[PDB]
Design a binder for these strands. Sequence first.
DNA 1: CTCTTTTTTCTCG
DNA 2: GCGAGAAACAAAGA
Length: 268
Amino acid sequence: PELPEVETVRRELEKRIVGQKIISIEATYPRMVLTGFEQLKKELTGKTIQGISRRGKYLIFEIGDDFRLISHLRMEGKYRLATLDAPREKHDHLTMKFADGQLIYADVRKFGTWELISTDQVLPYFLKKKIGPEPTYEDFDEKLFREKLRKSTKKIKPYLLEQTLVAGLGNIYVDEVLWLAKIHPEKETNQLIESSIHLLHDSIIEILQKAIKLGGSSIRALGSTGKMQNELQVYGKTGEKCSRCGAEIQKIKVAGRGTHFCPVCQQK
DNA sequence: CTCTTTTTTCTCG
DNA sequence: GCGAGAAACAAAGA
Ligand SMILES: O=c1[nH]c(S)nc2[nH]cnc12
Protein backbone atom coordinates (compact mmCIF):
# COMPACT_ATOMS: atom_id res chain seq x y z
CA PRO A 1 0.00 0.00 0.00
CA GLU A 2 0.89 3.70 -0.12
CA LEU A 3 -0.19 6.53 2.22
CA PRO A 4 -3.86 6.78 1.08
CA GLU A 5 -4.41 3.03 1.54
CA VAL A 6 -2.74 3.00 4.96
CA GLU A 7 -4.91 5.97 5.97
CA THR A 8 -8.00 4.08 4.77
CA VAL A 9 -6.99 1.08 6.90
CA ARG A 10 -6.30 3.41 9.84
CA ARG A 11 -9.81 4.85 9.63
CA GLU A 12 -11.52 1.45 9.40
CA LEU A 13 -9.55 0.14 12.39
CA GLU A 14 -10.17 3.28 14.44
CA LYS A 15 -13.91 2.69 14.09
CA ARG A 16 -13.70 -0.91 15.22
CA ILE A 17 -10.85 -1.81 17.59
CA VAL A 18 -10.55 1.31 19.71
CA GLY A 19 -11.62 0.33 23.24
CA GLN A 20 -10.78 -3.35 22.66
CA LYS A 21 -8.79 -5.25 25.25
CA ILE A 22 -6.11 -7.54 23.81
CA ILE A 23 -6.78 -11.01 25.21
CA SER A 24 -3.89 -12.78 23.53
CA ILE A 25 -1.34 -12.37 20.76
CA GLU A 26 -0.12 -15.23 18.54
CA ALA A 27 2.54 -15.43 15.82
CA THR A 28 3.37 -17.95 13.12
CA TYR A 29 6.04 -15.57 11.80
CA PRO A 30 7.53 -13.90 14.92
CA ARG A 31 10.51 -12.75 12.84
CA MET A 32 8.51 -9.78 11.43
CA VAL A 33 8.35 -8.37 14.97
CA LEU A 34 11.67 -6.51 14.82
CA THR A 35 11.77 -5.59 18.51
CA GLY A 36 11.13 -9.18 19.64
CA PHE A 37 7.88 -11.12 19.61
CA GLU A 38 8.02 -12.51 23.16
CA GLN A 39 8.69 -8.98 24.39
CA LEU A 40 5.75 -7.60 22.41
CA LYS A 41 3.41 -10.37 23.61
CA LYS A 42 4.41 -9.80 27.24
CA GLU A 43 3.93 -6.04 27.13
CA LEU A 44 0.68 -5.81 25.13
CA THR A 45 -1.35 -8.80 26.31
CA GLY A 46 -4.16 -7.51 28.52
CA LYS A 47 -3.77 -3.91 27.33
CA THR A 48 -6.50 -1.79 25.74
CA ILE A 49 -6.22 -0.17 22.34
CA GLN A 50 -6.62 3.60 22.87
CA GLY A 51 -6.26 4.70 19.25
CA ILE A 52 -4.74 4.31 15.78
CA SER A 53 -2.57 6.95 14.14
CA ARG A 54 -0.49 7.19 11.00
CA ARG A 55 2.79 8.80 9.97
CA GLY A 56 3.71 8.57 6.30
CA LYS A 57 3.07 4.93 5.33
CA TYR A 58 3.39 3.75 8.97
CA LEU A 59 0.44 2.61 11.06
CA ILE A 60 0.68 3.46 14.77
CA PHE A 61 -1.37 1.46 17.29
CA GLU A 62 -1.70 3.28 20.59
CA ILE A 63 -1.89 0.54 23.20
CA GLY A 64 -1.92 1.50 26.84
CA ASP A 65 -0.47 4.88 27.76
CA ASP A 66 3.16 3.91 27.43
CA PHE A 67 3.41 1.80 24.25
CA ARG A 68 2.96 2.17 20.52
CA LEU A 69 3.00 -0.59 17.97
CA ILE A 70 4.49 0.77 14.76
CA SER A 71 3.45 -1.30 11.78
CA HIS A 72 4.61 -1.06 8.20
CA LEU A 73 2.68 -2.98 5.56
CA ARG A 74 5.37 -2.53 2.88
CA MET A 75 4.31 -3.96 -0.50
CA GLU A 76 1.14 -5.91 0.29
CA GLY A 77 0.57 -6.39 4.01
CA LYS A 78 -3.14 -6.80 4.81
CA TYR A 79 -5.19 -6.53 8.01
CA ARG A 80 -8.57 -8.12 8.54
CA LEU A 81 -11.03 -8.45 11.41
CA ALA A 82 -12.25 -12.02 11.76
CA THR A 83 -14.32 -14.14 14.14
CA LEU A 84 -12.38 -16.11 16.77
CA ASP A 85 -13.07 -19.38 14.92
CA ALA A 86 -11.83 -18.14 11.53
CA PRO A 87 -9.57 -20.64 9.75
CA ARG A 88 -5.89 -19.79 9.21
CA GLU A 89 -4.98 -18.59 5.72
CA LYS A 90 -1.63 -19.41 4.14
CA HIS A 91 0.07 -16.04 4.56
CA ASP A 92 -1.34 -15.06 7.97
CA HIS A 93 1.56 -14.21 10.30
CA LEU A 94 0.18 -12.50 13.44
CA THR A 95 -3.08 -12.07 15.28
CA MET A 96 -4.34 -9.97 18.16
CA LYS A 97 -7.25 -11.75 19.73
CA PHE A 98 -9.99 -9.76 21.41
CA ALA A 99 -12.96 -11.19 23.32
CA ASP A 100 -15.32 -10.99 20.30
CA GLY A 101 -13.03 -11.27 17.27
CA GLN A 102 -9.42 -10.97 16.16
CA LEU A 103 -7.17 -8.74 14.09
CA ILE A 104 -5.02 -10.77 11.71
CA TYR A 105 -1.98 -9.54 9.76
CA ALA A 106 -1.14 -11.27 6.50
CA ASP A 107 1.69 -10.54 4.07
CA VAL A 108 2.54 -12.76 1.10
CA ARG A 109 6.11 -11.48 0.74
CA LYS A 110 6.73 -11.21 4.50
CA PHE A 111 8.13 -7.67 4.05
CA GLY A 112 5.87 -5.92 6.56
CA THR A 113 7.15 -5.16 10.05
CA TRP A 114 6.05 -4.63 13.66
CA GLU A 115 8.01 -2.65 16.24
CA LEU A 116 7.08 -2.06 19.88
CA ILE A 117 8.12 1.50 20.83
CA SER A 118 7.59 3.39 24.10
CA THR A 119 5.35 6.43 23.73
CA ASP A 120 8.07 9.06 24.33
CA GLN A 121 10.19 7.31 21.68
CA VAL A 122 7.72 7.65 18.80
CA LEU A 123 8.76 11.12 17.67
CA PRO A 124 12.49 10.21 17.87
CA TYR A 125 11.73 7.02 15.88
CA PHE A 126 10.46 9.05 12.93
CA LEU A 127 13.15 11.73 13.26
CA LYS A 128 15.80 8.97 13.03
CA LYS A 129 14.14 7.78 9.80
CA LYS A 130 14.18 11.39 8.48
CA ILE A 131 10.56 11.10 7.30
CA GLY A 132 9.45 14.32 5.59
CA PRO A 133 6.24 16.26 6.22
CA GLU A 134 2.70 14.90 5.84
CA PRO A 135 1.22 15.76 2.42
CA THR A 136 -1.15 18.51 3.61
CA TYR A 137 -1.24 22.23 2.93
CA GLU A 138 -0.67 22.84 6.65
CA ASP A 139 2.38 20.54 7.00
CA PHE A 140 4.00 20.52 3.53
CA ASP A 141 5.88 23.83 3.28
CA GLU A 142 6.63 24.67 -0.37
CA LYS A 143 9.46 27.05 0.61
CA LEU A 144 11.57 24.34 2.25
CA PHE A 145 10.56 21.93 -0.53
CA ARG A 146 11.92 24.40 -3.11
CA GLU A 147 15.19 24.81 -1.21
CA LYS A 148 15.80 21.08 -0.94
CA LEU A 149 15.10 20.61 -4.66
CA ARG A 150 17.52 23.42 -5.53
CA LYS A 151 20.33 21.85 -3.53
CA SER A 152 20.14 18.38 -5.04
CA THR A 153 21.20 16.75 -8.30
CA LYS A 154 18.98 13.73 -7.70
CA LYS A 155 16.30 12.77 -10.23
CA ILE A 156 12.86 13.90 -9.04
CA LYS A 157 11.10 10.48 -8.98
CA PRO A 158 13.63 8.61 -6.82
CA TYR A 159 14.05 11.66 -4.58
CA LEU A 160 10.27 11.82 -4.01
CA LEU A 161 10.25 8.06 -3.27
CA GLU A 162 12.84 8.54 -0.46
CA GLN A 163 10.07 9.89 1.86
CA THR A 164 12.34 12.77 2.96
CA LEU A 165 10.93 15.66 0.87
CA VAL A 166 7.38 14.64 1.77
CA ALA A 167 5.88 11.45 3.24
CA GLY A 168 3.58 8.95 1.59
CA LEU A 169 4.31 8.60 -2.12
CA GLY A 170 5.05 5.15 -3.49
CA ASN A 171 5.49 3.95 -7.06
CA ILE A 172 1.84 4.44 -8.06
CA TYR A 173 1.16 7.92 -6.72
CA VAL A 174 4.58 9.27 -7.69
CA ASP A 175 3.92 8.34 -11.36
CA GLU A 176 0.45 9.92 -11.05
CA VAL A 177 1.82 13.05 -9.41
CA LEU A 178 4.52 13.57 -12.02
CA TRP A 179 2.04 13.18 -14.89
CA LEU A 180 -0.29 15.69 -13.26
CA ALA A 181 2.60 18.11 -12.67
CA LYS A 182 3.94 17.60 -16.24
CA ILE A 183 7.41 16.70 -14.96
CA HIS A 184 9.79 14.05 -16.34
CA PRO A 185 10.61 11.39 -13.72
CA GLU A 186 14.33 11.74 -14.48
CA LYS A 187 14.25 15.55 -14.23
CA GLU A 188 17.16 16.70 -12.05
CA THR A 189 15.57 18.59 -9.18
CA ASN A 190 17.97 21.55 -9.29
CA GLN A 191 16.70 22.19 -12.84
CA LEU A 192 13.08 22.57 -11.69
CA ILE A 193 11.83 26.17 -11.84
CA GLU A 194 9.68 27.82 -9.18
CA SER A 195 6.35 27.59 -11.03
CA SER A 196 6.97 23.92 -11.76
CA ILE A 197 7.88 23.23 -8.13
CA HIS A 198 4.67 24.99 -7.09
CA LEU A 199 2.52 22.78 -9.35
CA LEU A 200 4.41 19.70 -8.10
CA HIS A 201 3.80 20.71 -4.49
CA ASP A 202 0.07 21.26 -4.97
CA SER A 203 -0.31 18.14 -7.11
CA ILE A 204 1.25 15.92 -4.45
CA ILE A 205 -1.26 17.17 -1.90
CA GLU A 206 -4.18 17.08 -4.35
CA ILE A 207 -3.57 13.52 -5.62
CA LEU A 208 -2.98 12.01 -2.16
CA GLN A 209 -5.93 13.80 -0.54
CA LYS A 210 -8.19 12.74 -3.43
CA ALA A 211 -6.98 9.14 -3.07
CA ILE A 212 -7.76 9.23 0.67
CA LYS A 213 -11.27 10.56 0.02
CA LEU A 214 -11.88 7.76 -2.51
CA GLY A 215 -10.81 5.12 0.00
CA GLY A 216 -7.48 4.44 -1.70
CA SER A 217 -6.71 2.52 -4.89
CA SER A 218 -7.64 -1.13 -4.59
CA ILE A 219 -5.59 -3.18 -7.01
CA ARG A 220 -6.18 -6.95 -7.19
CA ALA A 221 -9.12 -7.34 4.00
CA LEU A 222 -9.67 -3.81 5.30
CA GLY A 223 -9.16 -1.15 2.62
CA SER A 224 -10.56 -3.35 -0.16
CA THR A 225 -13.41 -1.03 -1.19
CA GLY A 226 -11.33 1.80 -2.67
CA LYS A 227 -12.23 3.62 -5.88
CA MET A 228 -9.07 5.62 -6.63
CA GLN A 229 -7.90 2.92 -9.09
CA ASN A 230 -10.55 4.24 -11.50
CA GLU A 231 -8.85 7.66 -11.47
CA LEU A 232 -5.26 6.58 -12.21
CA GLN A 233 -4.01 8.29 -15.38
CA VAL A 234 -0.74 6.51 -16.02
CA TYR A 235 0.30 3.81 -13.52
CA GLY A 236 0.02 0.33 -15.05
CA LYS A 237 -1.49 1.69 -18.26
CA THR A 238 1.39 1.09 -20.68
CA GLY A 239 0.37 1.67 -24.29
CA GLU A 240 -2.97 3.24 -23.39
CA LYS A 241 -3.98 6.78 -24.27
CA CYS A 242 -3.20 9.86 -22.14
CA SER A 243 -6.25 11.32 -23.91
CA ARG A 244 -3.72 13.93 -25.00
CA CYS A 245 -4.65 13.84 -28.70
CA GLY A 246 -3.39 10.28 -29.23
CA ALA A 247 -0.32 10.21 -26.99
CA GLU A 248 0.33 6.82 -25.37
CA ILE A 249 1.71 5.94 -21.97
CA GLN A 250 5.30 4.65 -22.03
CA LYS A 251 6.94 2.45 -19.42
CA ILE A 252 10.63 2.82 -18.62
CA LYS A 253 12.87 1.81 -15.74
CA VAL A 254 14.08 4.60 -13.42
CA ALA A 255 16.52 3.82 -10.57
CA GLY A 256 15.29 0.22 -10.57
CA ARG A 257 11.59 1.07 -10.56
CA GLY A 258 8.93 0.54 -13.23
CA THR A 259 7.94 4.00 -14.41
CA HIS A 260 4.81 5.02 -16.30
CA PHE A 261 4.68 8.44 -17.97
CA CYS A 262 3.47 10.34 -21.06
CA PRO A 263 6.59 11.63 -22.90
CA VAL A 264 4.78 14.43 -24.73
CA CYS A 265 3.41 15.68 -21.39
CA GLN A 266 6.59 15.21 -19.40
CA GLN A 267 9.58 16.55 -21.31
CA LYS A 268 12.64 17.63 -19.34
C1' DC B 1 13.26 -24.79 -17.25
C1' DT B 2 14.95 -19.18 -16.97
C1' DC B 3 14.15 -14.44 -16.45
C1' DT B 4 11.53 -10.42 -15.04
C1' DT B 5 8.28 -8.07 -12.34
C1' DT B 6 5.79 -6.45 -8.28
C1' DT B 7 8.99 -0.77 0.38
C1' DT B 8 12.72 -0.08 2.78
C1' DT B 9 17.39 -0.99 3.78
C1' DC B 10 21.97 -2.53 2.95
C1' DT B 11 26.54 -3.29 0.28
C1' DC B 12 29.70 -2.02 -2.95
C1' DG B 13 32.78 0.80 -5.71
C1' DG C 1 28.62 11.80 0.06
C1' DC C 2 26.76 9.34 -4.63
C1' DG C 3 24.15 5.71 -7.74
C1' DA C 4 23.60 0.93 -8.96
C1' DG C 5 22.26 -3.12 -7.65
C1' DA C 6 20.52 -6.40 -4.60
C1' DA C 7 18.53 -8.18 -0.38
C1' DA C 8 14.43 -9.50 2.51
C1' DC C 9 10.22 -12.92 0.05
C1' DA C 10 6.46 -15.15 -2.78
C1' DA C 11 3.92 -15.60 -6.79
C1' DA C 12 2.66 -14.57 -11.59
C1' DG C 13 3.87 -13.73 -16.27
C1' DA C 14 6.76 -13.95 -20.59
O1 LIG D 1 -3.50 18.79 -20.21
C1 LIG D 1 -2.53 18.06 -20.04
N1 LIG D 1 -1.81 17.58 -21.16
C2 LIG D 1 -0.68 16.73 -20.96
S1 LIG D 1 0.18 16.17 -22.27
N2 LIG D 1 -0.28 16.37 -19.63
C3 LIG D 1 -1.01 16.85 -18.48
N3 LIG D 1 -0.85 16.65 -17.13
C4 LIG D 1 -1.83 17.35 -16.48
N4 LIG D 1 -2.61 17.97 -17.42
C5 LIG D 1 -2.11 17.67 -18.66
